[PDB]
Amino acid sequence: CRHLLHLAIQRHPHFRGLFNLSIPVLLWGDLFTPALWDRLSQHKAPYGWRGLSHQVIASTLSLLNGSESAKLFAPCIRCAVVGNGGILNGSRQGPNIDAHDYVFRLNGAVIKGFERDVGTKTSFYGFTVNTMKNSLVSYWNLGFTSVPQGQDLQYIFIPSDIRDYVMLRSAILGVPVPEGLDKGDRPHAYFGPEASASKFKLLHPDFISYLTERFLKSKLINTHFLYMPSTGALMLLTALHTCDQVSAYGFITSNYWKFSDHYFEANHDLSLEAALWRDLHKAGILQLYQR
């Protein structure tokens, strides 16, 4: 159980020389050095922070000075990453999703009215501030009136913009976000009453670069005059590095056309990610749900 996942990574030579289970996954205080500031200042996108203010980043990363912000789990782990695809519509995969002890959800995590299909347990919620607010606008009349909240549930920020860093800073302090495109929003309205550093985590920009370099490097790279993996792909791979067993639900498959776009109703490579989950499923590393 507790190591029957990494064994399948060893039995296959393709992913053995691809999985680096030592590069950090989460960014926090004891990693923000002048050296890291010089490197990531040469990269835009969530791969770095070119053109981003040192005052904005040094103030939000210093709030993550706790030793608990380095890891995702407590000091066997079966995880379930639930994508918002339409294949879960009527699948009634509720009992299987909630059977896991850690459930990963992202973006429009519509639960009400679809609990029998996608379950009700939520342990992590990865998102960008852009896609989180966009889903709260378009999917409000479909159930998604708020992001999933819980007692020991933790949120994962994707550092794709200063809106993500400013939101992360205001979420821990409790003060409403005082600047940027999101000026005026109450962090407690999204995430809840508790405002501690143990509640909010940040994905490492070097971890996203490592994923886009080893696992999902497409031909859609127009940097001459950006491209990042989907949030669900970021969550599936983050759980692939931090869990002892992962099951993917509602992710892009070959027979995507048979179902709606979501089970309740932007430069990425859907076909590459879909093929990634296929080859990762043949190797015994991923329990990809299909039908």
Ligand SMILES: *[C@@H]1O[C@H](CO)[C@@H](O)[C@H](O)[C@H]1NC(C)=O
């Ligand atoms: C994996 O990454 C870590 C840190 O970046 C490095 O120390 C290690 O050598 C890498 N592994 C391989 C096989 O390159």
Ligand SMILES: *[C@@H]1O[C@H](CO)[C@@H](O)[C@H](O)[C@H]1NC(C)=O
């Ligand atoms: C798909 O989702 C819709 C919206 O909830 C629902 O009415 C329908 O029964 C589901 N299944 C099919 C096969 O359309």
